[PDB]
């Protein structure tokens, strides 16, 4: 997670070099917030990455601007991910429920 947008949607990227999740909106009632964190105080989010930017338009292709914005945020947030050990693999993994593992008991 990076920044809350002006419509309340959560601007997010778990980086495309790890997740195949781009710069994208999500919704806070539909995401689980784990208590593992990266300091992104020095991260310049571009000012134009807004809800008007992320709104669906109308056969879908990534524009060159959307290609270069994902790089411009990944080249900054990725050295912060790789400076804490095993978090890149942690983000590469997906979350799944298995036997005996109950969500009211697991603390995230």
């Amino acid at each position: 997670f990076l920044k809350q947008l002006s419509s309340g949607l959560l601007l997010v990227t778990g980086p495309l070099s790890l997740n195949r999740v781009p710069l994208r909106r999500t919704h806070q009632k539909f995401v689980i917030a784990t208590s593992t964190k990266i300091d992104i105080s020095g991260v310049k989010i571009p000012k134009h990455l807004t809800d008007a930017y992320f709104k669906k338009k109308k056969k879908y292709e990534i524009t060159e601007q959307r290609k270069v914005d994902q790089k411009a945020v990944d080249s900054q947030i990725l050295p912060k991910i790789k400076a804490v050990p095993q978090l890149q693999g942690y983000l590469r993994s997906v979350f799944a429920l298995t036997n005996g593992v109950y969500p009211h008991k697991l603390v995230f």
Binding site: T34, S35, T36, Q86, L87, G89, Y90, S93, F95, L106, V107, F108
Partner: protein
């Protein structure tokens, strides 16, 4: 053969109730199923506590059967039960249960990968010892 006896000065571990997870000293017995206890170093006020919620430990203080809280604390901090209780395997397998309770998702991922390795490194040498038994049994 019983080893743990309810007596004046036995440290008991409180299993449930409002003072669970704590250590008390049995100061006196009232009747069949209730004892005046007192934890002056584990923050438990002197009170009647039933026997079914305390679990007896292998620690016996020496104080009289009507001596007050400060003599109980004198015996407790002279015997150093706050460190001798922690040195036992009982408190270590309590705090291991606490740590597995406090595991976060990143913690569970790192545990999964480290255990994924440790089991395979042991598992190869287990079979290595097995065929080192069959090749040396003949």
């Amino acid at each position: 053969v019983f080893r743990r006896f309810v007596e004046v000065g036995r440290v008991a571990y409180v299993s449930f109730g409002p003072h669970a997870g704590k250590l008390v000293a049995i100061v006196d017995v009232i009747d069949q199923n209730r004892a005046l206890v007192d934890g002056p170093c584990t923050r438990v006020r002197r009170q009647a506590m039933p026997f079914k919620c305390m679990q007896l430990t292998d620690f016996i203080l020496k104080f009289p059967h009507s001596a007050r809280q400060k003599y109980v604390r004198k015996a407790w901090e002279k015997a150093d039960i706050n460190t001798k209780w922690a040195a036992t395997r009982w408190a270590k397998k309590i705090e291991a249960r606490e740590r597995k309770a406090k595991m976060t998702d990143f913690d569970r991922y790192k545990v999964m990968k480290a255990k994924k390795m440790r089991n395979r490194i042991i598992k190869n040498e287990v079979k290595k010892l097995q065929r080192a038994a069959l090749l040396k049994a003949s």
